[PDB]
Amino acid sequence: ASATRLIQGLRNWASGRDLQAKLQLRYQEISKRTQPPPKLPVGPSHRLSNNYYCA
Amino acid sequence: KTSFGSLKDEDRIFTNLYGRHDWRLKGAQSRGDWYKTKEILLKGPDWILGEVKTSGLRGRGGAGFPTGLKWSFMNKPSDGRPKYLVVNADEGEPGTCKDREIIRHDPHKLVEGCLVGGRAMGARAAYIYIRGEFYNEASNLQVAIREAYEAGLIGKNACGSGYDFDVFVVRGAGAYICGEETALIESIEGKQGKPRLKPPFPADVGVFGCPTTVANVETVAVSPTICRRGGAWFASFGRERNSGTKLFNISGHVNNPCTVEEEMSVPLKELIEKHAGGVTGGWDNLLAVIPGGSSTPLIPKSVCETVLMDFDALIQAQTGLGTAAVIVMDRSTDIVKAIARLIEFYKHESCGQCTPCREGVDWMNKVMARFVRGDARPAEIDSLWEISKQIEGHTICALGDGAAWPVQGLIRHFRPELEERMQRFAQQHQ
Numbered sequence: 001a002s003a004t005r006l007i008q009g010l011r012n013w014a015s016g017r018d019l020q021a022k023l024q025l026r027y028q029e030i031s032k033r034t035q036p037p038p039k040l041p042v043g044p045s046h047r048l049s050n051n052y053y054c055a
Numbered sequence: 056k057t058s059f060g061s062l063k064d065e066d067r068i069f070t071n072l073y074g075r076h077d078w079r080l081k082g083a084q085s086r087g088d089w090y091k092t093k094e095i096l097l098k099g100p101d102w103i104l105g106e107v108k109t110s111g112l113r114g115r116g117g118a119g120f121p122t123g124l125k126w127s128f129m130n131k132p133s134d135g136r137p138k139y140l141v142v143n144a145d146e147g148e149p150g151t152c153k154d155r156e157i158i159r160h161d162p163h164k165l166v167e168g169c170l171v172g173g174r175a176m177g178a179r180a181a182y183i184y185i186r187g188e189f190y191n192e193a194s195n196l197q198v199a200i201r202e203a204y205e206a207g208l209i210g211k212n213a214c215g216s217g218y219d220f221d222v223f224v225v226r227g228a229g230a231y232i233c234g235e236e237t238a239l240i241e242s243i244e245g246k247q248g249k250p251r252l253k254p255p256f257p258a259d260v261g262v263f264g265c266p267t268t269v270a271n272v273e274t275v276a277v278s279p280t281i282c283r284r285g286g287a288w289f290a291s292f293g294r295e296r297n298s299g300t301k302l303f304n305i306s307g308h309v310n311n312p313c314t315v316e317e318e319m320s321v322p323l324k325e326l327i328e329k330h331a332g333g334v335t336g337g338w339d340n341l342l343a344v345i346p347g348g349s350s351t352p353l354i355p356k357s358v359c360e361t362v363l364m365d366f367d368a369l370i371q372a373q374t375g376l377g378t379a380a381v382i383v384m385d386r387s388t389d390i391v392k393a394i395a396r397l398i399e400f401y402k403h404e405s406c407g408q409c410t411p412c413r414e415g416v417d418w419m420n421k422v423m424a425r426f427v428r429g430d431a432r433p434a435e436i437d438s439l440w441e442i443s444k445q446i447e448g449h450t451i452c453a454l455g456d457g458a459a460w461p462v463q464g465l466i467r468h469f470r471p472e473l474e475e476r477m478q479r480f481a482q483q484h485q
């Protein structure tokens with residue numbers, strides 16, 4: 001994504017495909033390495049009533 | 056007869072309940088006690104059991120087992136062990152203070168009941184486990200037992216009948232669970248008053264491992280009246296399987312808190328409006344009634360309009376008769392604080408023996424202590440219901456039942472009031 005448009009055009013002509021639209025080297029479009037803290041959901045047995053284990 | 060109550064004073068068993076006459080022997084013999092006791096003693100145990108089984112006398116302790124059928128469990132030949140009548144005189148129940156009145160104001164009626172009932176069950180002697188807090192009542196009873204000994208009514212050749220019978224009084228030591236018959240047996244035997252498991256029912260192994268019948272003060276004190284007046288006289292009051300007369304303690308939010316004898320199947324509204332002077336603020340100011348002492352679940356004003364004060368009509372009203380102690384709670388009552396105080400009673404009065412009561416009654420106290428403030432979410436109401444269903448029926452004695460039932464009554468009749476309590480906590484605190 002730092003290639004010159006001469007090399008970019010030669011490369012697109014040589015592969016026959018558009019390569020800047022689908023780059024295999026990853027850049028700022030990917031997810032952040034630091035994420036907000038999650039709040040994970042609980043399951044169906046996390047209840048206080050009608051939760052007999054034998055049932 | 057279909058309408059009950061309005062009981063005449065000629066049909067009261069407990070004359071001199073109010074202390075307006077002499078409680079001593081010259082008073083009791085001038086009211087009907089100790090009259091032809093020898094002619095009841097000399098007709099054998101079988102006639103006395105026939106008169107009590109005919110009379111429909113159920114257990115005045117609170118469960119209402121047939122007292123004649125209960126006493127006929129002792130009608131058996133001896134195996135070398137003596138037999139014992141034991142009179143349960145603890146009465147630690149909230150709302151219930153009638154046996155205090157019987158011991159304090161009709162002691163000779165209780166002593167003649169001890170003699171006649173012990174003749175009916177072949178008992179050697181009578182241990183009256185009186186409450187330790189009823190000290191003046193206990194010395195009162197001991198003076199009357201001294202008067203019964205010195206007149207030759209009890210002791211060696213009781214009432215001139217060739218029958219020997221002593222009457223012992225054992226004071227309690229401040230434990231509600233010692234009113235339970237097997238824990239009362241353990242408290243007489245000088246141990247921790249912890250309830251035994253059943254079987255052996257105490258007619259097999261009771262106090263000291265002897266055959267034993269534990270009977271309430273009221274269901275003992277009415278027995279000479281049943282022997283003299285007859286079984287048909289006692290069965291002529293109240294419905295079938297609901298016979299007799301009954302003492303009632305109407306306390307709480309009433310104008311005149313009182314103890315009164317009344318016919319068995321009396322309506323609750325008639326009883327409160329007649330003998331108690333009505334609810335404070337009138338009958339329309341009524342919120343709830345704990346019908347029969349603290350263990351029985353409460354009933355609201357929509358049930359209190361047409362309900363009757365006996366065993367079957369209260370079991371049909373998804374509560375119990377219990378000790379027939381009416382605790383009246385008006386519309387100004389924080390009912391959650393009262394029932395949480397009642398569960399605080401049942402964990403302060405719990406002997407700690409088996410797992411569900413020892414753990415779950417404290418855990419229901421903690422849940423109810425959060426329900427008073429509202430510091431809980433409504434998924435803990437049904438949870439609490441399940442906790443009551445894990446104490447009801449899984450304990451040794453029925454104090455787990457008596458602690459799970461008021462929670463169930465408060466939930467079953469006032470779930471929306473608990474939910475609005477908790478949601479107003481959640482909106483003014485979050």
Ligand SMILES: NC(=O)C1=CN([C@@H]2O[C@H](COP(=O)(O)OP(=O)(O)OC[C@H]3O[C@@H](n4cnc5c(N)ncnc54)[C@H](O)[C@@H]3O)[C@@H](O)[C@H]2O)C=CC1
Nearest residue numbers: 116117118120146147148151234236256350377378452453
């Ligand atoms: N009077 C008071 O101060 C208080 C009374 N209670 C009452 O106590 C009751 C719970 O007491 P429990 O004795 O556990 O109830 P219940 O199940 O046992 O039985 C009542 C009586 O019947 C006898 N009995 C029942 N079936 C028998 C059988 N097959 N063979 C021999 N005897 C038999 C028991 O020994 C007991 O004396 C409750 O209904 C409650 O209302 C509770 C608290 C205080």
Ligand SMILES: Cc1cc2nc3c(=O)[nH]c(=O)nc-3n(C[C@H](O)[C@H](O)[C@H](O)COP(=O)(O)O)c2cc1C
Nearest residue numbers: 114115116143145146147234235236270271453454
């Ligand atoms: C926790 C508990 C406490 C009890 N306390 C008393 C009591 O204080 N006085 C009483 O007469 N019965 C009490 N009972 C009921 C007795 O177990 C028993 O039913 C009664 O004393 C005698 O039975 P009867 O009524 O058939 O004669 C209590 C029961 C339980 C489960």
Ligand code: SF4
Nearest residue numbers: 407408409412450454
């Ligand atoms: S359930 Fe409670 S009252 Fe009964 S034996 Fe156990 S600790 Fe005692």
